[PDB]
Amino acid sequence: PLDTTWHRPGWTIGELEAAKAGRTISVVLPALNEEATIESVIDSISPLVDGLVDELIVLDSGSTDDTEIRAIASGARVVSREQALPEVPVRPGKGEALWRSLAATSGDIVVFIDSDLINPHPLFVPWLVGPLLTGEGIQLVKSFYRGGRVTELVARPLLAALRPELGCVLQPLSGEYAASRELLTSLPFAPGYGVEIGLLIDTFDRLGLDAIAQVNLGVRAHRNRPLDELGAMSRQVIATLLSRCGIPDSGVGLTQFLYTRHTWPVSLVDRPPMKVMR
Amino acid sequence: PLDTTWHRPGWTIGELEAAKAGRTISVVLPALNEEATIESVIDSISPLVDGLVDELIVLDSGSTDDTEIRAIASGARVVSREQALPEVPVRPGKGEALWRSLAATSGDIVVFIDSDLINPHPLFVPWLVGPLLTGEGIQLVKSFYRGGRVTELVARPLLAALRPELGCVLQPLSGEYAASRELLTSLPFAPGYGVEIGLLIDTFDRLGLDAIAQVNLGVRAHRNRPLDELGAMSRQVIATLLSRCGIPDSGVGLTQFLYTRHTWPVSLVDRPPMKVMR
Ligand SMILES: O=c1ccn([C@@H]2O[C@H](COP(=O)(O)OP(=O)(O)O)[C@@H](O)[C@H]2O)c(=O)[nH]1
Numbered sequence: 001p002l003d004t005t006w007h008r009p010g011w012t013i014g015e016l017e018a019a020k021a022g023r024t025i026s027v028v029l030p031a032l033n034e035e036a037t038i039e040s041v042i043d044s045i046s047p048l049v050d051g052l053v054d055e056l057i058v059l060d061s062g063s064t065d066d067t068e069i070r071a072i073a074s075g076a077r078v079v080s081r082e083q084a085l086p087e088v089p090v091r092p093g094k095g096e097a098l099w100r101s102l103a104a105t106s107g108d109i110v111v112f113i114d115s116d117l118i119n120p121h122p123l124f125v126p127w128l129v130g131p132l133l134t135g136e137g138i139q140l141v142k143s144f145y146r147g148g149r150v151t152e153l154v155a156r157p158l159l160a161a162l163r164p165e166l167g168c169v170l171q172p173l174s175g176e177y178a179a180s181r182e183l184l185t186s187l188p189f190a191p192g193y194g195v196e197i198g199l200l201i202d203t204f205d206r207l208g209l210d211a212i213a214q215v216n217l218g219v220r221a222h223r224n225r226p227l228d229e230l231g232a233m234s235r236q237v238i239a240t241l242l243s244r245c246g247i248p249d250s251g252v253g254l255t256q257f258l259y260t261r262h263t264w265p266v267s268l269v270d271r272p273p274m275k276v277m278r
Numbered sequence: 279p280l281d282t283t284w285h286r287p288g289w290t291i292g293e294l295e296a297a298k299a300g301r302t303i304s305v306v307l308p309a310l311n312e313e314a315t316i317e318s319v320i321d322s323i324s325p326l327v328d329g330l331v332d333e334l335i336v337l338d339s340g341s342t343d344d345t346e347i348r349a350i351a352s353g354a355r356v357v358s359r360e361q362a363l364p365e366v367p368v369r370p371g372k373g374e375a376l377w378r379s380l381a382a383t384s385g386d387i388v389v390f391i392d393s394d395l396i397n398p399h400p401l402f403v404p405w406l407v408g409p410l411l412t413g414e415g416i417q418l419v420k421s422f423y424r425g426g427r428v429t430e431l432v433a434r435p436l437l438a439a440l441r442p443e444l445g446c447v448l449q450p451l452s453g454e455y456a457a458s459r460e461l462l463t464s465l466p467f468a469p470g471y472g473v474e475i476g477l478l479i480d481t482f483d484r485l486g487l488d489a490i491a492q493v494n495l496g497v498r499a500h501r502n503r504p505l506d507e508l509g510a511m512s513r514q515v516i517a518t519l520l521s522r523c524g525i526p527d528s529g530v531g532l533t534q535f536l537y538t539r540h541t542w543p544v545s546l547v548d549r550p551p552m553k554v555m556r
Pocket residue numbers: 030031032033034061092093094097114115116175223224225
């Protein structure tokens with residue numbers, strides 16, 4: 001029921017660049033403390049600039065390490081959250097950075113690539129924009145690949161429970177996807193780690209499956225985090241997913257006993273469609 | 279807000295056995311293919327028989343390996359699901375076995391110990407019945423200890439979302455707990471791996487927190503399973519948890535792409551309170 005390129009796409013960079021037909025392509029890498037990996041990621045994409053890709057920015061989500069200077073040294077334009085929308089104070093979390101990035105870019109197509117990937121293939125951006133440029137009716141392109149414990153224990157079982165029409169999607173929370181600016185500026189942006197599951201469910205409720213494609217990116221690798229930082233990610237994924245399914249969420253943060261106690265933040269506050277800022 | 283023995287309880291086996299006061303104690307080990315571990319588990323408890331513990335059974339949930347003969351060789355009474363309730367056909371899953379075991383035992387207090395524990399401490403049963411025998415108003419005693427990825431990514435975040443009053447419980451899905459027969463035969467029994475989260479939420483909705491205690495069992499170890507068998511456990515945990523929170527569950531099983539497709543069963547069918555079979 002869901003368009004799925006299962007094996008390596010066949011289009012070439014010149015074919016895809018032809019099919020642009022006046023549309024522009026923006027690439028955004030959100031970065032919070034990724035000095036180790038940001039340079040390899042930028043370098044996998046920058047060859048495409050002025051060709052297929054018209055714009056590449058690194059949205060610096062508050063990095064205190066060498067992310068900014070290493071990204072500058074790789075030729076990337078670096079935008080802080082403040083610089084993307086200065087009149088609006090900054091909130092924490094990933095969803096904030098991706099929402100803000102819509103103001104700092106202008107491509108008709110926006111591509112999101114996580115800045116914590118290790119040895120990312122240089123055909124990621126070409127593989128993601130493929131269905132947008134060639135397919136008709138595609139507005140969102142998620143990716144799948146190949147670890148994935150929030151996805152496989154939280155997101156996918158919960159979608160099976162509440163939005164079973166999205167059971168065919170293989171990586172709902174994937175950080176690598178592309179979508180049209182029209183779609184992105186229409187949708188609200190969940191906070192924190194809810195942003196991906198939120199844009200998936202919202203796109204489906206607004207356009208159905210036939211506007212959603214997914215593409216195989218081979219196999220991936222990234223930081224594999226501690227189980228506790230996943231508890232908080234899981235919580236925010238649940239919070240967002242319940243909201244889009246009309247289920248009230250208590251707003252209570254996950255408390256963990258390490259034994260010593262600590263409560264993690266969870267946000268129920270979405271950012272509005274970027275359209276309202278026109 | 280929740281009674282919690284944080285460190286090793288102080289009662290001794292003779293003190294606890296005095297506080298029995300005419301009540302009997304039944305111990306149940308549900309077993310599906312546990313030949314490797316069933317003997318060590320039985321042996322940690324059998325010294326207590328005819329003393330604190332009045333009855334120990336192994337409810338054989340369909341084992342095709344040497345679980346039954348090794349359990350017999352360790353002096354345990356072995357009951358099959360058929361033998362516990364012959365007039366009712368057998369359904370799969372853990373919840374079925376624990377429900378059936380209420381018919382095959384008769385203690386005023388029932389203690390459940392997973393038969394897949396490695397080197398279980400012989401004070402587990404004494405530590406679990408402690409609050410039931412000495413405390414007043416305690417009807418359910420959960421355990422905590424010390425891995426725990428369904429618990430920490432699914433159960434606890436979801437309880438925070440939907441039943442935040444149970445955020446203090448440290449291991450909602452723990453297989454080691456004790457409860458009164460009156461409570462257990464009043465409650466329905468979720469199917470499969472939903473049985474623990476179901477008995478927790480149901481007990482709370484019926485008696486509040488002050489009927490629930492939890493006790494430290496130190497540190498544990500068991501099989502650490504594949505991520506896919508956890509996906510299905512997670513699904514059934516979600517299914518049961520949504521039901522007790524009045525949220526409709528689609529009944530759609532989790533589909534996984536290993537890429538090759540496969541859908542796992544999920545059950546929405548609880549067993550009724552064992553009382554209805556009187
Ligand atoms: O407030 C935030 C949180 C995350 N990220 C980015 O989102 C991606 C996914 O974050 P995750 O925490 O899963 O990875 P890690 O922290 O291990 O690098 C990474 O590129 C982060 O730099 C971000 O820009 N802002």
